[PDB]
Amino acid sequence: IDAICKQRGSMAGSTGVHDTVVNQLLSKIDGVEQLNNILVIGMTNRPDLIDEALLRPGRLEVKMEIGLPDEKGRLQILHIHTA
Amino acid sequence: DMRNELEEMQRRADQLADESLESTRRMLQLVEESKDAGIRTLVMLDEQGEQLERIEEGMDQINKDMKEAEKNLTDLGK
Numbered sequence: 001i002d003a004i005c006k007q008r009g010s011m012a013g014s015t016g017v018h019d020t021v022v023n024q025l026l027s028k029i030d031g032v033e034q035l036n037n038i039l040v041i042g043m044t045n046r047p048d049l050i051d052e053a054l055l056r057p058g059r060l061e062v063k064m065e066i067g068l069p070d071e072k073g074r075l076q077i078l079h080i081h082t083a
Numbered sequence: 084d085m086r087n088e089l090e091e092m093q094r095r096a097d098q099l100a101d102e103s104l105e106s107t108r109r110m111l112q113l114v115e116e117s118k119d120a121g122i123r124t125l126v127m128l129d130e131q132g133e134q135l136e137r138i139e140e141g142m143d144q145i146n147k148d149m150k151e152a153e154k155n156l157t158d159l160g161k
Binding site: 012014015017 | 084086087088
């Protein structure tokens with residue numbers, strides 16, 4: 001998702017294309033017309049390049065970090081992959 | 084920043100015709116001629132029907148006359 005949504009007004013705007021896309025996405029996720037039956041999932045390797053208005057409560061607000069495992073995690077994975 | 088964008092222009096393909104003005108006129112002329120021929124045939128057929136109806140009465144009259152004459156002659160003969 002970091003390839004589309006980036007901080008508004010920082011880059012050259014992809015020739016005025018990226019800003020419009022970000023605005024459209026923000027308007028659709030939460031706007032005047034209310035939705036209650038959607039779930040959006042995003043995945044990225046560069047979390048620091050994402051817009052700050054898209055990571056607020058009422059928007060993509062549950063942020064999680066997946067890191068290296070410890071001995072128990074490695075044991076669980078090895079049990080998974082040799083069953 | 085060599086990110087270009089474009090806009091589009093449209094053109095309309097010629098409408099369905101430019102073959103409907105040479106065979107068309109000939110078709111219309113032939114249709115008119117056929118209509119005139121049909122009218123003439125109508126008139127002639129009506130006249131023929133009238134003439135056949137006229138013939139019928141003379142046919143019936145001659146049949147009746149001959150039958151009556153034959154019966155009368157037979158009656159007098161015997």
